[PDB]
Structures are given as structure tokens and as C-alpha cells.
Design a binder for these strands. Structure first.
Ligand SMILES: [K+]
Ligand SMILES: [K+]
Ligand SMILES: [K+]
Ligand SMILES: [K+]
Ligand SMILES: [K+]
Ligand SMILES: [K+]
Ligand SMILES: [K+]
Ligand SMILES: [K+]
Ligand SMILES: [K+]
Ligand SMILES: [K+]
Ligand SMILES: [K+]
Ligand SMILES: [Mg+2]
Ligand SMILES: [Mg+2]
Ligand SMILES: [Mg+2]
Ligand SMILES: [Mg+2]
Ligand SMILES: [Mg+2]
Ligand SMILES: [Mg+2]
Ligand SMILES: [Mg+2]
Ligand SMILES: [Mg+2]
Ligand SMILES: [Mg+2]
Ligand SMILES: [Mg+2]
Ligand SMILES: [Mg+2]
Ligand SMILES: [Mg+2]
Ligand SMILES: [Mg+2]
Ligand SMILES: [Mg+2]
Ligand SMILES: [Mg+2]
Ligand SMILES: [Mg+2]
Ligand SMILES: [Mg+2]
Ligand SMILES: [Mg+2]
Ligand SMILES: [Mg+2]
Ligand SMILES: [Mg+2]
Ligand SMILES: [Mg+2]
Ligand SMILES: [Mg+2]
Ligand SMILES: [Mg+2]
Lengths: 139, 121, 129
RNA sequence: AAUGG
RNA sequence: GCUAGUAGGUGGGGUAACGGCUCACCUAGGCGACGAUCCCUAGCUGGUCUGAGAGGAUGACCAGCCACACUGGAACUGAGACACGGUCCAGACUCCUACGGGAGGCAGCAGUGGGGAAUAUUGCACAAUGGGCGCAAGCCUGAUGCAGCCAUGCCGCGUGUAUGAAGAAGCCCUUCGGGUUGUAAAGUACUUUCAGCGGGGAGGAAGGGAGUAAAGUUAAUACCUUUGCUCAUUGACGUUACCCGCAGAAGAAGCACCGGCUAACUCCGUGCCAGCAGCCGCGGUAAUACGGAGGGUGCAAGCGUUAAUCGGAAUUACUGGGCGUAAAGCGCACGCAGGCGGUUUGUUAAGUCAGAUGUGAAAUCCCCGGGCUCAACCUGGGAACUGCAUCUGAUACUGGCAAGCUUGAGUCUCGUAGAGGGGGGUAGAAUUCCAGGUGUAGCGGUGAAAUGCGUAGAGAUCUGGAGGAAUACCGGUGGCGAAGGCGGCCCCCUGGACGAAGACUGACGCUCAGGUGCGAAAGCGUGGGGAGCAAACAGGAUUAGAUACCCUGGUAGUCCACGCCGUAAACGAUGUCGACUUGGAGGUUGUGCGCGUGGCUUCCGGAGCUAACGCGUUAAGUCGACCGCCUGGGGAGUACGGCCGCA
RNA sequence: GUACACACCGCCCGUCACACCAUGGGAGUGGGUUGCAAAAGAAGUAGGUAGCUUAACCUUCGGGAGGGCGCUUACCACUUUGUGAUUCAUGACUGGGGUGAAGUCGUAACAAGGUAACCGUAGGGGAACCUGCGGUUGGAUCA
């Protein structure tokens, strides 16, 4: 972890010296990725950090960020109830999760009829889904 | 206190501690972001205020508030912090200086630009 | 125990003026009589009288003006706990001159005015305004 | 001189 | 607690000189609660900043002093060093090499790398001032004088002036009428600092030379020196300051703020989101608080923000604060050191006071004047430097010393009241238990119950006995005690208080850090004791649950002896001592002659005091002495360390 | 009487759960400084002198004096050893504290808060607390 500080400074200097050398941090994976014009190039750069900059580092394959999607269409009901301690909270929603055309993205549909779900709560329903979809449903 | 009592023990002043110890009597200090996250303000206010744990060059790690709307600050970002607590965020005693080092100015700002590191439009 | 007879005199005077007493009495002493002389000449007390030999007793006749005590204030300055001695240049002006300050000088107990003329400082006994 | 409101 | 060359002495040596400086010897000293020793921090000062001041903060730049020179030692040379650019040894580190050996010290000026939020050119001249050397000329000088960079500060100045109304356009608002932006614009007159271009042109320059004459010089009129005189020169800055001409308004305005505090308000977005925020706070359908726009306000080549110091903060209160309930009186007492101390005479003069004299660098500050076109800046003189010495006086007070004196304090004589303490003995009532008699189905308990007890005879009642603990009534805003406390009766031992009338001593006092003693209940140790009561515990109820409240039981403990613990809302939440200042109504205990006079105590209340409540001669009034103690709420009377304890 | 003031449908306590921050303890682990007891001894200086050597003076011309070198001793830097003290950093794990949601469990206080509250102490209990013993009023109630 001590080297991490030195590593930052080292990368900056190296980037200035060599235009083709590039360094960046992938936000999703939270990983600093080095880019070069070949294996030999990056090898030399790494060794320079180890000695000149005195930053012992280890390189590897850049971690890949994966995504998930539903393959089948199904209608599901979600219900909550908490009257155990004092104030009671309740909420119920019947949603149909249908596989979307790849690239289209999340498409929440408000097909509530007769205001079975109050209009004010509908945005929160979507928000809840978005948050849950941001988290993994599989891996 | 009688004079005799005062002869034995003089009047004592106050320590007067600083509310910005990490700065160590410096106007600003450079640091590196160790985690950029959001937190909720204490009652009665309500929002998702943006903060970042930052390790200073002196060796102190402190939470600093990222002022303005939107930030380009990720982990391992070199930012300049200054004094300034956030009343509704307990623990936050420092403010990131927008428009200095890595930290960029607030985009689409027409007022108080100097305070948000925005050049004259 | 009793450790400041002068302040005791000053207190008896003040307490007497408030209680609208005709005259106050106390154990007599050379310094008390000296201060009494100063107050009388300045017209703060009507008159004083010392009686007795084995135990001389000083009686101070208090004076009141328009149903109001002539002495509005009488505060001891130098005290056993804290003695205070001022030079002639450092002499105090009580009530911007309107009041007197009893100063013990080498030439004798006198008002701040008298001491300032004689070019002598000393122990500031009290402020009587 | 029950208990909870 | 510290010290062993330590402390002192004697002698010798040593030094420029005094000296445990050193050494031998002798003595056992020296230092420290007026803080030694040890630990932490730090260059000191004139001054700087802040403050009305007293203070608080601070010691870049300037000047004085000190210390240091890669690190640790050591001498040498010298008038002077234990020496930035000297030597020697050792160490760390770096460099060169022919590998056989060598070399070095930017905390001089530039400059590099690094660290950091951040601090400038490997510049010019020795023209001037100053310094080294020299006969001088001169030479050397990163001292110094200048130039470069930087809005870093202080100060000055410009970015135009006048006019210009349907006041246009546009923007913005709009009550859709207008208004506001706004004479602001355009337009029309008009002047050009400064900038640019060109031209001219101070002062900082004094000296030093060549000599030329005179005087001195002596043998000489030589030489040389000195003073006149003549002549040619001596500037980095520098393309100087400054002045003139040039044409043209040309080339010159930004930043923060407008909810209140605090000068400046609307429209439209956003809708507890996104944001804002010194503090208070804003934002969920318009929000003068966010976001953006118009308009306004404050400043200006700057404007904001952050950091930092002082002030405001009387919020460490010396000036200039508090402790009944807001933070704050040690549980109580004794008492050392310490602090303070009644009245008189003499004496001294320590403090104190007066005067004189010396000193208190310069600068800075302030005042009055000059020079810079003005200002900033520079400079003359003065004042100030509040202080510290020394000498000669005054002596009221304070201190010392001597002799005193009763009035503080104390002693003795007599009497009075008291649950004051310690020890021992004893009486009555009651409970429990034991044995027996009489007698029969209940008893006991609760809101109601139940557990429990009883026909294996309870409960009730009577008789005898055992044992422990506590003392009805008296009994009380009664009493006694430093406080904690102290209650049947009697005896023994013992403390204190108060009254009357005298005598005696002669300030012998007050307070008290540290220290020491005493100190409810609970608890702890050992050995006893154990009726009643009762933590724990058990069962029965209650309740949604009931580790409770209630019922039935029950152990430590409660009791005693001895030892320990040391704390309580140990409270009047009010330290102790002394003096002074209207009244009224009571309790209790002396004393004098119904009226007095002491001690103690309860209630009320005046002035005064208090934020108020209240306090009010038993002050929380008015003063003096001394001690303790407080400085937002939490964290915390806790952690750590020490001391104490069996725990 | 009151700790209530969208006024008892008030206010309000602690455990447990979760997050985060600072911190105490902790087998130890790494540094700094330092005490005591020793050891050591470069260079230099001073003292002494087995030896060796020598411009100035003296001399009988041989020498002598004096010096230098060398050696030796004393002092002493680096350094070394043992054992303490202090301070700083860090440490599996652990204790309590603070802050934060709108979790869970109760309702301890505020009215006599439904068992007056609180103080000291002892025992007990998921928790707020409960019980005993003594103390305080900073409790209400009395018709
Ligand atoms: K010595
Ligand atoms: K040194
Ligand atoms: K004071
Ligand atoms: K004493
Ligand atoms: K005297
Ligand atoms: K028992
Ligand atoms: K005391
Ligand atoms: K605090
Ligand atoms: K911890
Ligand atoms: K309770
Ligand atoms: K208790
Ligand atoms: Mg230092
Ligand atoms: Mg102050
Ligand atoms: Mg106060
Ligand atoms: Mg209090
Ligand atoms: Mg008391
Ligand atoms: Mg004197
Ligand atoms: Mg005297
Ligand atoms: Mg008796
Ligand atoms: Mg007991
Ligand atoms: Mg019971
Ligand atoms: Mg029982
Ligand atoms: Mg206590
Ligand atoms: Mg108390
Ligand atoms: Mg006492
Ligand atoms: Mg009263
Ligand atoms: Mg404790
Ligand atoms: Mg630790
Ligand atoms: Mg040697
Ligand atoms: Mg309750
Ligand atoms: Mg209760
Ligand atoms: Mg209560
Ligand atoms: Mg219990
Ligand atoms: Mg009591």
C-alpha cells in the first residue's frame, strides 16, 4: 500500500516522458490499467518503476466488468409489511419483468389502472427497481 | 481568588484548539482520494451529499466535502483541500478546492465562479 | 479576628450614614484621629471627640445634607492583604477631583490635594467622595 | 388500594 | 529530593587574569518546597502585531548579542580561532582511477534535485559607500551599489471630458397601461495623462593624474610633503529622472455579495431532490436563501476563500468575575510552614516617599520641520524609553528592635442545664421458641387469590421456661455534641458550654497548603451472638411478559469484641474568625431588681442585597483576614501514572 | 405539582442490531533518548625516558648542552558489552465512549408518572432497572 502512493507519482512522470505510455483507472473495476505499444514496452516501464521509482508492482489481465439480463418473462408480486414495532409500513406491487431488446436498457412501464398504486409512490417503485437492478441478481 | 492565592497559582489562559488540525496551520494541503462516496445529512436536512476520504501529504486521512454539482473525482485523485466544515455532515471539516490540481471546476457556472474554479465565460 | 481598624472605622461611618445615625463611636487611635481630622476639614463629618484615658473612645458626629448623607462613598484602598503606595505623580483623583483621597505621607496624613502641592506621595488610605 | 389507557 | 571536585579550607601547579581551573591533603559540607533534581519546549534583545489601557501574541525583513559551519573529537598558528571556503584523527556519504591509489563538504552568491500550499536570475559593476593589501598607482571584494522575476504588500495614477431623449434597440419587469436598464447607447462637440514613436537631457563624481607655482625641506633651490593653480579624464544603473514634439479616445474593469445578523430584490427553473450554509438556517409547487436571468449593493487592478494573531471576550476578571438553587465551601476538626494581626512611647529606616546624579545603542513609535510633482518613501531636531543603579534626605503608615498597656485571647474562684463520650449493672412491655393444660376446625393472607399452616389437634386461651434485640408514655420548631451523631433506670470514669462577681497573665491572636485525627449506612477480617427484621434465594399471585411492585417463606447482614474501609442530597446544597447595621412575636437555660441583664434557638419582617426565588443582626446587608473552589454541555470524576486498601 | 407547549395521542431511558469516528487495555513488534556498571584508546597535548639521531651555543675539538625521533604513561573521540528508565510508532484480540434512520425489546424519569424521586453502599437482573440498609427534600396528598 505504501508503494501505491509512489506508484501514482511514477505513472505521472512516465506518462510525461513517453507519449505512447498511457495510464488510467477503470471506475467500475476500480483498477488502474496501463497501456503500451507492446509487451516489451510495458515490461521496460514496469521494471523502471520497480527500480528508478522503487515501486514494486505486479501486472496482470485487466478485470472485465460483466452484466446480467433476464432470459424469460414473468409476472411477480412484491409485498412489504412492518407493524411489529409501533409505526406500520405496507406496500404491494405487481410487476412483469420481460426481457428487453439488447441495448434498449431498463424500461419501467406504469400500467397502473384505477390508481391501485398511488401516483406519488410509483416513482419510488421505479427507484427501488433501479437500485435493485444496479445490484446483481445473479453474480 | 485572593491575591495570596493568585501569588501561589496565577490565572491560566485557554488552549484554543483548532477545528482544522489536519491542515497543520497551512492554508491548503494536497491529498489523494481513497474513497469517493455519498452520505446523508443529519436531521433536519435531507440529501445525498458527496464526500471523499483523502490521505494528506502530512499523513492524515480526513473526509472532505466536494462542493458544487457534479465532480470528476475518482479514487487515486490528487486534490487540494482547505478549511471549512459541513454543519449537517458530522465529521466533514474540510472542503476540496474546485479548479485546482485534478479537481475540475463546476461546469455551467455563471455566479461565484472564483469559488467553484470556473474561468470567465 | 480584627486585622484592620481603619476599615472598621470607615465601615462604621458608612453603616451609620445609611442608618441615619447621629454619631458613631469606636476605640480611638492616633491614625483614626488623623483621618477624622482630614474628614472634618473637608466637611465630610460634623465633628469628632476622643474621651477616656485607659481606653480612649473616638466619637464621630456624622453630617447629613438635604436628608442625604454627605459621605456618598468611603472605600479603603490600601489594606493589610494588599498595601498600595503611590508617588506624587501617580496620585489619584477621586470623582474627578470632587472627592478626596486620604494619603499617608512622611509629612503626615493629608488629602491627595495637599500631598500633590507638597510634592509628596505615600500610602493611599481610602477614597472618600 | 386489580390492571392498561 | 539532588550532589562527591561535590561544598569549603591549606599548599603546589596552571592561566593574560580571578577561581576546584587542576592536584594532594583536610573538613563534611553544598543545594532544594522562594521548586532543587529530572522531563518537555526554545536562540535572546531593541522591537512587531493587537489592545483605551493593563495585557495577549510574536521575534521574517533592520540593528545589537549568542551559537553553529558534513557528524564527533583535537589541538596548531596567531593580537585574536580551538578557525564556512585551515590542519589532524574518527565516522557517515559521494566521486575519480591506469585499481597502484586519490578527492570532497553551497547554513557565502547564483543554480540543481527533493520536500512542500508556497518563496525569484547559474544577471551587471566595483561608478559610489565600506573592507584587505600596498609608497602609491592599483588589485581583490556574490560585501555593497544596481539590474531580472513575482499584484506579495504599501502608495500613486490611467482606462477618457462635456453634451446628448421620446428616454432609440434590445433586455428585463409589467398590474399588458408603463417602468426599469438609462445620458447609459448612438450621435455631436472635446481634451490626450499614461502607453507607444521620436527628440533633447539632471544628479549620484568625491577623488585620482599630468603637472605648475609657493611654502616647508635640508648641504641643496634637493627628494618628498603640504597648500594654492592649470589641464585632460573618471557611472553599472542608463535608451536615467525629467522636459518637448507626434497622432489618436485610441491601448486599459474586474471580483464578491443582496433571508436576518449586514448595504443590495425580482422573474423563471428545481421541488427535502439537486444544492447552499460564519451563525441562525434554507430546499417537498414560484424559493429575495438552491439553479440561472434582470436589477441593485460593496470594493477595485484587484476581489474573494483558506490559514494565522489580537480584539470584541469583564469568557482567567491586576486593572476588571464568581461559589444558597445556574459551574464552584474540603464530611468535620486540629495544626506546621505560610499569610495577616489590638493600643502606647522610643529607636531604626527595610518597605514607602522626595530630590540629585549616572545609565536606559541606533533605528522604530509619537511630535514639530525639511526632501522626494503627491503619497508611499527618506531625512533634521525634540519628546519618549514608563526602567535600573548610587548618594543625600522625609518618616505618616508598614517592618525591625526595646520598654509598655488592657480592650483580643487565656487562667482561677462559684453555680446551672443537657439523649456529650467510655465502662458496668439492672427493670418493664412485647415478639419468637420450648414444655404442659383446655378446646375443635379452621387459621393466615389479598384488590381478589393462591402458596403456606391444621384433625399426625392448628388458630385461640392459660401456666412454666429459654434467648436475642430495642427502650411506649415523658417527647417538644426540647436539649447536648466539631461534625458523624446521642433517648428506660442506676453506678463508676471523663469532655465541653453558659451565668454572676472578682482576681491574674499581658496580644500569648486569626486562618491554614502539606500533615494528622474524627467520620451514617452498607461492606471487609477474626471470634462470638442470633428473638425480630431482611439483600440473595424459593414458591404463589399480577401481567402480553413481571428476573418487580403484593403474599408465603428465608440467608448474609442487622447485635457484640477487636481490626479495616473513609464514603453519603456526610445539606443550611451557605468555609472559618472578627466588627458594624430598623423591628416584632416565641422556645430553652442562667442572673439581677412586674421591670430588667446574659447564652442558645424558632418564626416573621425593614433597609440593603438578589436573575428571581428569597436572605434579612443566627445576612445571602456593610467591611476586613485567611483558606478551599469554579470557568459551556457531553466525553468523565473516567483513562493513564502515583498513593492508599484484604477486597 | 410538572423535565409538557401541534401542550399526555406530551416528553423521555437503556440494551440489542447496523454504519462510522476517536480512544483505553493487550502476547508482543520496531524506533528515539537516556541511567548505571564495564571495556576500549585514533589523533592531539602533557609527563617520563631503553634506544636512535643531530646546523646555529660550548668545546680539551673528542665531546657537552639542547633538540628531534622512538618508546612509555595520563587524559580522551569512535566503538563494544551487560542491565535498567523513558518516550514514540505499531499489534491478533478486547473494554467502554461518541455520532447516525424511520430496526428490535420493553417503559426507568417528568403528575403522588401510577412502587415519590434522589445520594452512599451491597446483592440481583436482557435492558431501562429491582431489592435491602441508612440519609436528603431537590415529593404530592389531608378532605
Ligand atoms: K570543578
Ligand atoms: K558541533
Ligand atoms: K479581581
Ligand atoms: K503560624
Ligand atoms: K516607624
Ligand atoms: K437469618
Ligand atoms: K479551609
Ligand atoms: K468541549
Ligand atoms: K478498539
Ligand atoms: K422507580
Ligand atoms: K439503592
Ligand atoms: Mg531550536
Ligand atoms: Mg481578557
Ligand atoms: Mg461569571
Ligand atoms: Mg451547583
Ligand atoms: Mg460545610
Ligand atoms: Mg529605606
Ligand atoms: Mg513601628
Ligand atoms: Mg458531665
Ligand atoms: Mg455497620
Ligand atoms: Mg418479602
Ligand atoms: Mg418474613
Ligand atoms: Mg464527596
Ligand atoms: Mg458539597
Ligand atoms: Mg480551625
Ligand atoms: Mg425572612
Ligand atoms: Mg476513580
Ligand atoms: Mg494501543
Ligand atoms: Mg595514543
Ligand atoms: Mg414509569
Ligand atoms: Mg415511579
Ligand atoms: Mg418523583
Ligand atoms: Mg429483586
Ligand atoms: Mg445527616
Amino acid at each position: 500500500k505504501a508503494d501505491q502512493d509512489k506508484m501514482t507519482q511514477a505513472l505521472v512522470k512516465l506518462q510525461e516522458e513517453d507519449p505512447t505510455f498511457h495510464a488510467h483507472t477503470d471506475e467500475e473495476t476500480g483498477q488502474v490499467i496501463i497501456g503500451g505499444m507492446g509487451e516489451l514496452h510495458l515490461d521496460i516501464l514496469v521494471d523502471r518503476m520497480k527500480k528508478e521509482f522503487n515501486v514494486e508492482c505486479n501486472v496482470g489481465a485487466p478485470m472485465v466488468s460483466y452484466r446480467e439480463t433476464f432470459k424469460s418473462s414473468a409476472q411477480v408480486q412484491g409485498k412489504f409489511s412492518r407493524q411489529s414495532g409501533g409505526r406500520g409500513q405496507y406496500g404491494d406491487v405487481h410487476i412483469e419483468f420481460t426481457p428487453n431488446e439488447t441495448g434498449a436498457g431498463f424500461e419501467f412501464e406504469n400500467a397502473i389502472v384505477g390508481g391501485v398504486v398511488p401516483r406519488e409512490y410509483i416513482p419510488s417503485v421505479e427507484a427501488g427497481l433501479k437500485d435493485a437492478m444496479e445490484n446483481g441478481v445473479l453474480a | 481568588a485572593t491575591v495570596n492565592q493568585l501569588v501561589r497559582k496565577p490565572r491560566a489562559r485557554k488552549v484554543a484548539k483548532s477545528n482544522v488540525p489536519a491542515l497543520e496551520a497551512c492554508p491548503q494541503k494536497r491529498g489523494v482520494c481513497t474513497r469517493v462516496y455519498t452520505t446523508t445529512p443529519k436531521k433536519p436536512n435531507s440529501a445525498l451529499r458527496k464526500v471523499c476520504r483523502v490521505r494528506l501529504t502530512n499523513g492524515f486521512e480526513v473526509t472532505s466535502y466536494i462542493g458544487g454539482e457534479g465532480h470528476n473525482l475518482q479514487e487515486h485523485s490528487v486534490i487540494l483541500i482547505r478549511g471549512g466544515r459541513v454543519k449537517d455532515l458530522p465529521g466533514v471539516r474540510y472542503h476540496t478546492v474546485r479548479g485546482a490540481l485534478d479537481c475540475s471546476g463546476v461546469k455551467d457556472r455563471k455566479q461565484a465562479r472564483s469559488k467553484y474554479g470556473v474561468k470567465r465565460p | 479576628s480584627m486585622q484592620d481598624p481603619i476599615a472598621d472605622m470607615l465601615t462604621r461611618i458608612r453603616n451609620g450614614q445609611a442608618a441615619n445615625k447621629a454619631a458613631v463611636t469606636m476605640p480611638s487611635s492616633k491614625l483614626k484621629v488623623a483621618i477624622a481630622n482630614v474628614l472634618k476639614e473637608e466637611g465630610f463629618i460634623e465633628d469628632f471627640k476622643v474621651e477616656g484615658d485607659t481606653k480612649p473612645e473616638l466619637e464621630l458626629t456624622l453630617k447629613y445634607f438635604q436628608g442625604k448623607a454627605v459621605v456618598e462613598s468611603i472605600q479603603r484602598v490600601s489594606r493589610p492583604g494588599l498595601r498600595i503606595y503611590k508617588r506624587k505623580d501617580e496620585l489619584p483623583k477621586v470623582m474627578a477631583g470632587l472627592g478626596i483621597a486620604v494619603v499617608s505621607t512622611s509629612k503626615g496624613v493629608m488629602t491627595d490635594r495637599a500631598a500633590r502641592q507638597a510634592g509628596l506621595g505615600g500610602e493611599i488610605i481610602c477614597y472618600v467622595a
